Each structure stands twice: as structure tokens, then as C-alpha cells.
Enzyme design. Structure first.
Site, mmCIF file in Angstrom:
data_model
loop_
_atom_site.group_PDB
_atom_site.id
_atom_site.type_symbol
_atom_site.label_atom_id
_atom_site.label_comp_id
_atom_site.label_asym_id
_atom_site.label_seq_id
_atom_site.Cartn_x
_atom_site.Cartn_y
_atom_site.Cartn_z
ATOM 1 C CG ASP A 1 39.054 42.411 42.386
ATOM 2 O OD1 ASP A 1 38.094 42.164 41.621
ATOM 3 O OD2 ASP A 1 38.901 42.728 43.577
ATOM 4 C CE1 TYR B 1 32.630 42.140 44.638
ATOM 5 C CE2 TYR B 1 32.045 41.834 42.338
ATOM 6 C CZ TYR B 1 32.824 42.433 43.307
ATOM 7 O OH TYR B 1 33.797 43.334 42.967
ATOM 8 C CG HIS C 1 42.070 48.700 44.474
ATOM 9 N ND1 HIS C 1 42.341 47.941 45.591
ATOM 10 C CD2 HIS C 1 41.123 48.025 43.781
ATOM 11 C CE1 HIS C 1 41.585 46.856 45.577
ATOM 12 N NE2 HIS C 1 40.844 46.878 44.484
#
Lengths: 294, 294, 294, 294, 294, 294
Positions: A113, A218, A274
Site C-alpha cells: 500500500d 493521501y 487485500h
């Protein structure tokens, strides 16, 4: 058969230690074990995680003679939460400063990630320093797989918008980290996880500043996209391994990696979502050990 | 003699597993154990419960060679919480899709409370598929026992009104799930239960959407009454077992079942309240094993 | 034409006063105006209300020479909240003690909802003391209209069950009085009311003990049903007026009153919901004045 | 030497059971063990306690052949929380109904605080039924020791005023039961207790209705004083034992008991505060066993 | 020059009224004024708004002889919040049922944001019933302007993702409606608005069920996109007016409408943001009156 | 006749001012008006009050040519909240320092509740500085009326105990000041007061430190009782006026003052509760003016 077993694996507490590295501005927390002289293996978690996501991978790596270093990157876990520096390229520089402070230069690198973005920026910036790189679960900014999810309005990245709302994201989620992060985790898992293990992450993100610093990763995404497309004009030279679970990104992780590197192999974990380190650490460690010794 | 002993029985963690089934829209959570080839036994909880209510019944079933499947039905436990589909007949279709995905067709079926409504709708819709059906603790909509409680304004169904208030029920009970559900549980029990076991349920209903989805089962009741009275024009052909505790519905469970089925036997658990799997699992398992092998 | 106008009507503050009356074990709050020697008219609110519901009716009564007395009954508004005495017959004794303390004996009496139960128990216990009785909006326990609503499980009394759960109702609604009570009020109105006026009621029930005291009115219903059925064997001799809105109980208020009294007349307010004094005080005022002078 | 050891003593879970007794209106919770045929010993806790306060006394009693019955009296612990009936004489009637339902008539009786008030009212009302009575820690209403604390404004009964404020006490303390009760407990102890043990009580009083019902015991005090002074005109005939710790009421417990009974002996526990069963169970059990066999 | 003036314009309260209309399964709240026989003009708000957004436009329409009807659509403001029916085509059916209930058939129709989607589905389903259609501020699903915003990942629709997370959106924003909605509003305005006026909207969405009902509008978007693309194969025959502010969608509102209708004219409000009725009602009113009389 | 009229009397804002006085270790807030050269009249509030309690008395005093000084004493209202000095004699020193700082020496002095204790300690310590002393509503420590209330355990001082529990009182009441203080106020009034006026007091005690500082007044009572009994061996020489309402302490205020002073006159306000300045300022004002000019 077997119900989920929470916590650190048996014998973990004896062979790993928690430590800090003070960089120029920022203090980073990491956990390390294995032979002091072994080839260093660095493991980088993503959002919403800490070093703890690797708990079932780290002992097998140490027992094969690797010096294991699992880092809480800038802003996560027990590391400091500075004002800025959350673009992945600068975060790769934090990891490199930590590696050098530990006496190493050439390393093996595993990321998932946000951590696979950091890891890739580490390899693009210092390609001679990364012996092998393993890429898990999520595509990196700049790739077509990344851009396709964005143009599709893919449901599983609905949260990019919310997280990119400065102050609004923090105000909505402060005090509800556990309900928010558990829901986030379970919607993307396929193997049943223990609430106690997911709560280790959620409690980390309820600490002061942890929500803000997580969200600034982000908020730097548009900067990462620009920086990463520049990185991608030079394909990576070192061997690369791409892994993901079949219930989530699956084969797209290997598609994504081939836009990044010349020397690429991949696999898809069966009946895995995931969270490869949480859900199928057995498959993950076997793939890593075969890759690192190859 | 003995104080309440909370948690899973000894050896449970080794012989049962948590798993998911993805249906067309909805993902259902269930726990399974026992021989892969054994006759399948499906267990359906009620409100406010999860699969966990069967923890003391499932090992004995597996040890007698049954393939045990304890499901969190639509909206409960770790299953998804979709917008609709909470009428019991459609929920019976969810369970059937799960059964078929596991390779089975003919099953034994046990339900209590909302789960016995789901179970009955499964038998009425697909009578050739239910080998034996056991009905615990609560009457189903459409029966006279059901209608009599409603016309009496029976105290122990005071909550139907509240639960049927959309948004008001959620706003009042959100944040107080533990105090509300513990009070609900203890007022209907006769055997002393452990707060830790009841808190497993309460925490499940505090998860996002769990209150709403639980209440929509109640909000579909008028639709269930209409659908179920139509079902009742064809009595069930398969053997049926009716059980309830003497401190709660008692013999009325067997009265209720005789309006539903042709082949019916029943028993009343002594010194047992509303929660047969929690309160008197020894009586319950003996009755089920005698019934299933008969 | 006209938007809702919140607050007391123009000139009210000058002509009416707030007062307290100390009775044996309760202090009652009431609002009064009109000539000190006029025939007394007592107005009794219901749940969730205070004397303030009569704000638009009281000036016209006073200007016609009546001594107006609008009472917050035991436990409501600014009155005391004692431990018990919430059965309606005993509460009617409170009202009588107050009337006598003010020097009066014969009264005209008006009630709605809980206040119409108190009013009926006043007329049943001391019939020679009630000159005329007006009954608004809600049927009284013991009547067929009351018994039919319970056996039908009428949706508009869904809250009886919740309100009868001691401690559970208070715990769920404490801190949410405004949202709970404004939703309750608006679902039963037909004329648009001002949120500011409904908030006067809601704020009264947030005061210490006000939720408990109100719910104890509901918890006394089975005692009230027994007592009222005994009262009903002797139909009331004095003239009775029954009123209700067409969007709520309508003609059933007059049906119900003819079971209680020998001399009964009634009317139905057009385009009017459950709250006659709030929604259509002009209709109510004309009806009350024609009735009182007849 | 030794740090506080929280929880039930070793082996407790095997020899005691939790059970319920349904009386006419109210359900009482109690814990019992020891020989089914043994002389019954009933133990009554005070405020803010449950049966759990006796955990270190109950095994020794059972091992000497007593049938031990430790009751959560009306409103406390896992017992029901009814609207009224909190004067001690009526609460003594609850205990007697429980004793009779268990087949006994003559009992040994031990009470502390509110429980010693209940116990005394049991002996005054049914003197032939109480074989021996032990009185711990607190004086009963009606005695001079009681009246002297009140006229002195003794600091350790400061809370009588607060607890006697209906609704105000609940509104202030709801949500803060643990901080309030721990502070209350530690200010009156001399032996260091474990927070985990005190939290068992505090959590009981945070359950719905537990605060109100606990406070209504205080609100009935003026009624108890009147009833108890009438009881005191007939001195008790059975042997009585008075015990208290030297850091709290000490010798005043025996002074108090001599106004109540003809046959009285007493002792003062050394280096012991207000909570004899919590603080010095060894001294307590030795005194009780010598007393009961004498 | 002039500071923001909060509240309704002078004289509004006297000329307009609040009313409810009971439809099959929804009660709608609306505000109306103007001559009872005038041509009807229906005004439809969006998210996060109520009828109150039209406060400065309604008097001028009424003074020009139109019968003004400003609706709180299904789920908004003082309207009911049912379980479903939040796809725009079904909501357009609500508006039509209300229009017919008021005795009208042909209407002029004005919508913005969600209300302009409802308005378009009204004109597409019953084109002969819409005399003229005015489309404000926001593009409708199915158009190229709508599809471009999603594929661009336009920042101003960041909230679509969050709003589509069922239960998660409600849990995060409940209790924070004012802060969430005032930030949302001010980021899209260009004219300074009064916090008191935005707080009228925010308070409406804090009422029970209002967050859920609003978010269900977003959750129906994929159903709406499918339905509208089918509507768009037949361009609307009646005259269409498109308006938007230059600081928001500007000329794209007219681009979008020319994909939907054959007879289209438009204008762009200068120095005006996203909220045309709030920010520049004078421009809007002139445009609407010239269009309606043309 | 007349409803409660909240707020300052008409014309107050123009004639009075708010000011601060910096003393050695405390800044005091006070409100003043009247001629700069008039004889000074000092008015001292109690608990839970501020200067605002004198709002209806101050204009009449100023219009009669007095220099009015209404003080928020140490810790109250807008004054500072220091660590100590809450014994009344030391607080009387604060008032004197303020009077001297304003250029005055001889004063007329008015106090109620805690303010009447301060006022008495002012007159006892500096008798030549007090021209006349008015004593309202509450007896002072050391008197027989004070000692009888404690030994009777008078219900209206139930709060002394709670207020003397340091940290416990603050923790229980913080965040509940309005509900706590409005209940306290209304239970002791007889004239209906406006919630808006009581909320002025309640909001002052919610400010940081205001609860602690108020409760420290109660915690100093045993120090005050000792000090005042020493003061009382010398009865005051200056004229004294004692007033209280008939529904509260009534004639006992004059009984109490005759134990303190040689030259005493008094009156009892009819139909007046505990709060003379709030409930019956007209009676108070006439009494004060007749006394001051006599």
C-alpha cells in the site's frame, strides 16, 4: 480448520526489539531481529497499519538469516508526526537515512500500500542500493492501473476524497477510529481476521496526530503522481516480485509492476484479500524466501 | 454446582473455522466444522444474536458426524448490512444460496427467534430440501400463538413498537447497545449467564449498520405475516421438532408448530428461559441428536 | 395564509400570571387569568405537553369573564416530580385540592390526552363538582375505543411499550428529549407548528425527573384501566363535549364519550391533527364558548 | 506481606452457583453453596455492594457445613429494580420469602450497612425465625449511635443528603459510577483493596435502574427510623454478634447492638476500616464460626 | 453595499403558508403562496437544502400572479423519511402526486442539484405536463458534463464516495451536521451568506433520519445514471432555461441542457457561486420571470 | 397580574456600568451607578448568584442619590478565582479593599446568603466603617438558627455535605450547572422566576473555576463557624435590618440578627421565598429606602 488466533506468534517477544532512530528532524520507530550481520530486509506497512502487520513474516525471515527491520514510517505507529514531508519520495529518504544509521547500504525491500509507494520511490531514487524489491497488494501512483481506478471511480478507493479533505476528515473520524478502521479492514479482507489484531492498528491511529499524518499521505497523492511519472521514465534494473490476493487486486499487481521494472515475476495468493501479511503470511513468506535466495 | 463459565468450550478453536460466502449482492459470514462429507446441519440465530449462540451445541453435532454450518444471517454479526431484503422469505433464500455454494442440497435445519422464521420460510418454499427442521423458543408470524401475543399486548414483545420506528430506534440505542442488550437478555433468561458472553452479542450490534439491519427485520414483520399465512395453507411434510424453556414460551412452541406441519414432536426444557442454546445446551443437544438420528 | 407564529399571543403576558400551589405532598405550577370572581375553567394538558398548549385558548376564555386556570399536573412542567401518585384518579385529587385552595368548588373542566383521563377521574369521583366537561383528542382507558387500539396494535400507540420499560426508557431518551419529542409531535400534527413552540415542551421534559414522571403516567395504565372500568358503571350526569381532529381520532372521541356520559355532544375539527389546542385553537375556542354558555 | 489479590478465591467457581428466586412481583438473584441440608446462613450486603462482598467468607462457611445463601437484595446486583418497596422492613420480607422458597424457616443471618438494617428488621418482625444474628460495620436507624451521627453532621454520612435528592442524585452520578464508587470505597477502607474488586460493585450500579433503586433505600430512611423505633420497644431474644473495624465505627457497633438485643457479644477488628468482608475476611470468618457453633 | 441579511424577506410570513400533503407512502411538506388560481410554479431544492433556499424568489413569483409551490422532496426538511424511493424518477412521481393533489396538471418547474435531477425525470416521464423547465447549478446524471466530472475525479464531488458508504457516512457525520454542512456550503459559495441561514439547512439534516435519507439520494446515483441515459434518447420538447454561477459550473449548465432538450436558452450569473437562490436571487428572479412570460 | 419579565429593567443599561478593581491577589468585578459623590451602598449576593440578583433594586437606590456598588465577590461571576481566601472574614477584607479603592470609607451594606456572612464579618471587623447593615434571607454561622438547621438535618441544607466533598462535587456537577442550579433555585422560590434570569446565574458557574470557587465557600464553613462565634461576643453597634420571605426563613432572620446586634429591626416579605431580590424587589426596595433614610 482453526479460529483466528490473535497476537504475536509464539516466541516473538524473545527475538525482536523495539527501537528508535533519530533523523534530523524526525524520530522513527522500528522493530528488528535476526542476525546482526545478515542481509538487511526492510518491510514497509501501509494505511491503516504499523510494523505489526508483518508479525507473522518477520520470524521466518530472521530464521533464514535475514536482519529484519520493520519500520513505522513518518507519522505512523510510534514514529513522530511532523508537519510535512509526506510525499512518498521524501519518505523514502527517511527510510534510507534509517538504513544508513544502522550501518547498511544495500538492502532487500518489501512494501505494501503506502509502503509500496515509499519502497518504489526508494528504488527509483537509489537503484543501485536496492538488491531486490517485493511489491504487495496496491498499485503505485503514475501507473495505468492506478489511473484506471481513478477514472472508473472504483468503489474500493472511495475514501481518497474524504481523506483529502483537510480538517474535515480528522473532525469526522476523531473518536471513531476503531469503528472506522475495523469497517475498512473487514470490507477488504477475505480470510477472517481477529478484531483484537485489527484493534492494534486502530488504537495507533487514535493517538495524537496519527489521523492527520495518515491523511497527509493521501493529500500528497497529486504530488506523488507527478513525481512518480518522472521516475517511471527509467525502468528499475533490480529483480522485482509482485504479489496480491485473488479477491482484491490479484494479477493487476504484476501488470502494474511491469510498467515499473525490467526484471519482474509475480504470483496471486489464492483465497486472499487485500491484506497479504495479515491474511496469508504462509504464502507470503514462501514467495519472499524463494525470491530472496534466487 | 458451578459459576457461569464464559467463552468458547475447550477445544473449539481447533475444530471450527470462520468463513465467508459471497452471494450476488451480499457477503455472509458463517462458522463451520465437522466432517466435510457429513450431513449438513444449519443453525440460525435470532435477535440480538450471532452464530456464537450455538457455541455449546456445535461440537457435539460435529462429534456425531454432522457438518455444522452456523450462519450470521443477512445484516447480523460479520455478514454484510445491505439496504433491504430483510423479509424472512428472502433471507431464507440467502441461506439456501449459501448451502448450494457449499455443495449441499438436502440439510437439517435448526432456528431460534428470527432464525426460526427464516428456517420456516426455507421449509415452506423448498419442502423437499429440508430433511428435518427444529424450531426453538419463539413462534413464527402467521400462527395463532403469534397473533395472541399481539392482541394481548404481551409484555415480552413490548419492543416490537420501538424497533419498528425507523431512525428513532437507532438514534435512541446507538452508543447504548451493551446496556440495552444486556437488559434485554437478562430479563428473559432463567439460567444465570456470563456478562462476557452477552457482551459478544452486544458488541456485534454496535458495529456500523448492525442496529439498522437488525431493526429492519422487525420492520418487515407485517410483510412476513402476510407471506407466512400464505405459506401455512400447505402444511410441512418433513419431521419437525419444537423446543422451548418452561420459564418462557414453554409448550406454546409445540402448539405453534402443529399449525405449521403434519409430523411434529416437542419437549419443554426444565428450568430454562428464552435462550435455549445459551441456557440449557445439554438438553438442546440431546434432543437434537435423538431427533436427527431418528 | 400565514407562516407559523411562535410564542404567546399578543397581550398575554399582561393578563396572565404563573403561580405555585403547595398541596400535601406535591407543589403544582399553574397559569391563571381572568376575573378573580368568574366561573373557574380548568384546562389539563397531556404528554408531552405543559400548560403552554392552552396559550391560544386562554385569552378568549378570560375575555368572556371566566377565571382561567391552566395546570401543569403532577410531574409535568414546573410542577414537582414525586415518587408516586401517577394513576389518573389520584392525580385528579391533586387538581381538586388546587381548585379548593383557590376558593372554588364547581368548575368547568377541559382535558386532552393524559389530562382527559385526569379530567374524567375528577368527574367520576366528584360529579357534583363538575359543571361541564370537555374531552379532547384522546380516548380514556376502559372504553372500547381504548381497548380496540391495543388489540389492533395500532401504530400510533407504539410508544406505550417503550414508556412502560422503567429505567430503560429514561436511559435511552435522556439527552435526546428534543429530537424524540419533536418527532413524536410532528408525526401526529396536520397543521404546521413552529419548532420553537414544540421546543417549549421538549425543554420541559429534559428537566430533572421529567422523563421519569411522564413515563410513570404510562406505567400506571393497567391500574387506570381497572379503576376506570369501575367508574364507567355509572355514566356521568353533567353535560359533556367531545372534540378531536379529523386527521387523528375524529369521530371516535364522541363514540368514546357516549360510553362514559349520558348528556354528550361533539364535533370534529376539519384539517386538524392530534393536537387541537396547538393546531386549531380558533375552532376549539368557539366550541368551548358555545358549550359553556349553553 | 502481599499485594492485593483480586477476584474470587481459588476453587470458588466449582462450589457456588448463581440462581434466581421469583417472588410475587420481584425476582431476586443470589449465590449459594455448601451442603443442601446444612443450617442455612444468609448474608446481606450493603451500599454500594452486591453478594460479591462475601466472596472470601462464603467458602469457609460452606466448608464448616453451612448452606450459604448470599442475596442481592431488592434493587441491587442482578436482582430486579421495582418501583417501590425499599423500606428495610419490606425488604426483610423479600429475604424471608426467598428463605421459605428454599425450604428453610430457621436461619443464621449476617448483615452489613443497608443489609444489617434489613437483617435487623427480619429479626424484629420474626424473632423466632432467626437463630443467630451478626451485625457488621454500620448502626441501624432508631439507635442513639445513628441519631448522634445525624445531629453531629458526621462527615462520613455526608452523602445521605445527596442520595435523598430524587433525580438529582441519578443525573449527577449516571455515567460516573466508577469514579464515584471507587472514591467512596477507598475513603472508608484501611486495608488496601484492588481496583478490580471495587469495579465489580461499580459496574453493578451503572446497570439500568441500579442507581435509582440504590438511592431509594436512602430515601426511605425517615420511614425506617419511625418503623425501627417501634421495633426497638421489644428487645431481640436471640444471640447477637456485633463487629466493626477499629478505623471506622469500631466499638460503636456493639454499643448500638445493645440497644437492640438482650444477648450481645462483640469484637473490634484490628487495623480494619468500614468494609469488614473486603478488608479482613479472616477475622470475620473466625468470629462467625466461633459464634455460630457456640 | 450591505452585510448579509438573514431570515425571510420582509412580508413573507403573511403571504405564504406551510402545508403537508399525504401521498400513498410519503407525507411531503411544502410552502405555498400566490393566487389560488394562478399558473403553478414548482421549485425543487437540492442537497443540503430545504424549500427555504427559495425564500427570496418566491415573493416575486407570487406578486406576478403565479401559484408558488416550494417542496421539501421525499426525505428532506419536514417531509417523511421512508425506507426507499430515492431514485430521482420515483421522486419525480412524488412531486407529480402532490401537484395533482393540489388540483393542477400543467406546471412550470424549477430545480437545482438533486432537485434538477427530479425535475428532469418529471419532464422526461410526463413531458406534456411541464410547460417550461428551468435547470440550475448542477448537471444531471447521464450527461457528458456529469460523466466528465467523475472521470476527471473532480474535487468538488469528493463527497460522492463518502455519501455512498451506507451507515459509515451517518456514523461519522451524526452530531456534526452543522460543522459538516456549513463547511460544505461555504466552500462552494462566492457571495457571503449568513451563518444563520445556512444553519437553517444544517438543523434540518440533524433531525432523525435526515442524514440517511439525504445519503440515499447519492446511493441511488448508479440507478439514476442508467435510467437517465434511457430518458436522454428522447430530447425534451418544452422550452428549457439553464442557469449557473460563473464561480461554479457556469456555461456547463447550458452545455448539459442542450444534450437533454431541443429548445434551450441559458445565462451565467456574474460573481455567483454554486447556490444561485441563496447568492443572487435578484438575477435568478429576473431570469425566471422573463422566461415564464416569454 | 403579569408573566415573568426577564432581563434588566428598562433604562438600566444607560445608568450603570461594569468595572474591574485590581486588589493585591484578586481582581473583583462590580457594577456601579448613581451619583459619584453619593453615600455608597454595597450589595453582596450569595450562592448560586452574581451581582445580577440586585438588578431590580439598584435603579431605585441610585435614583434616591446613593452610589450603588454591586460586587461579584472573590470567585464569583466575572471576578477572579484564586486558590484560597474563601473564609468569609478574609472575603470581607476584599470588599473593604474595593470600597477604599473607590475613595469611600463609610458604607451602607446589604448581603444575602454567603454575602450576608461576608457582610457580617465586614461589620464585625470594622464596625465604625458600616453605617447601616441589612441582612437578608439566610442566617450566619455561629448563630442558634444556623446550629439548629445542622442538628435538625434540615432538608434545605442537604447540599452542604456534597459541596464540601472536594473534587467530587466539581466532577459530578461540571457540565450540568444549568440543570443543577435551576433545580436548586426553583425549589426555594415562591414567586415564579424566568428561566432566562436563572440561566444568567447558571452560566456564570459553568465558567472555568467557578464551581470550585463556589464550593470552597462551603468548605470554609468550619473555619467560619469558629471565627464568627468569636465575633459574636461583641454585638454590633450600628443599626441592623433583617429581612426574609415567609415561605423560607421568615421571622428566623430577625431572631438570628438579634443574637448579633444590639439595634435590630426586621420584616417578613409576604408570599416570598428564599430569593428576596429576585422574587419581591418592590418590598425589598421600600424596606431598604425607609431604613437608610431613618
Amino acid at each position: 480448520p482453526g479460529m483466528p488466533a490473535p497476537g504475536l506468534p509464539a516466541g516473538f517477544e524473545r527475538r525482536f526489539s523495539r527501537r528508535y532512530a533519530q533523523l534530523d528532524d524526525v524520530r522513527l520507530h522500528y522493530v528488528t531481529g535476526g542476525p546482526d550481520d545478515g542481509e538487511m530486509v526492510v518491510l514497509l506497512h501501509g494505511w491503516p497499519q504499523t510494523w505489526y502487520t508483518w508479525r507473522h513474516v518477520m520470524p521466518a525471515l530472521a530464521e533464514d538469516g535475514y536482519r529484519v527491520v520493520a519500520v513505522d514510517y513518518r507519522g505512523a505507529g510510534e514514529s513522530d508526526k511532523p508537519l510535512g514531508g509526506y510525499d512518498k519520495a521524501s519518505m523514502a529518504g527517511d527510510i534510507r537515512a534509517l538504513v544508513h544509521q544502522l550501518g547498511a547500504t544495500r538492502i532487500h525491500l518489501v512494501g505494501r500500500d503506502i509502503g509500496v509507494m515509499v519502497a518504489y520511490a526508494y528504488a527509483a531514487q537509489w537503484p543501485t542500493e536496492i538488491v531486490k524489491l517485493a511489491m504487495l497488494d496496491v498499485p503505485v501512483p503514475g501507473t495505468r492501473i492506478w489511473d484506471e481506478a481513478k477514472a472508473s471511480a472504483d468503489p474500493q478507493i472511495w475514501h481518497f476524497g474524504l481523506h483529502q479533505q483537510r480538517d474535515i476528515a480528522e473532525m469526522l473520524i476523531a473518536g471513531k477510529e476503531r469503528a472506522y478502521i475495523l469497517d475498512f479492514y473487514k470490507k477488504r479482507t477475505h480470510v477472517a481476521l481477529s478484531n483484537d489484531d485489527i484493534a492494534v492498528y486502530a488504537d495507533a491511529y487514535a493517538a495524537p496526530g496519527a489521523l492527520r499524518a495518515g491523511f497527509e499521505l493521501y493529500r500528497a497523492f497529486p504530488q506523488d503522481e507527478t513525481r512518480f511519472k518522472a521516475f517511471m521514465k527509467h525502468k528499475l534494473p533490480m529483480p522485482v516480485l509482485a504479489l496480491a490476493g485473488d479477491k482484491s487486486n490479484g494479477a493487476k499487481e504484476l501488470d502494474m509492476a511491469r510498467e515499473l521494472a525490467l526484471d519482474v515475476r509475480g504470483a496471486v495468493a489464492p483465497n486472499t484479500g487485500h491484506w497479504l501479511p495479515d491474511e496469508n503470511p504462509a504464502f507470503l513468506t514462501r514467495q519472499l524466501l524463494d525470491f530472496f535466495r534466487e
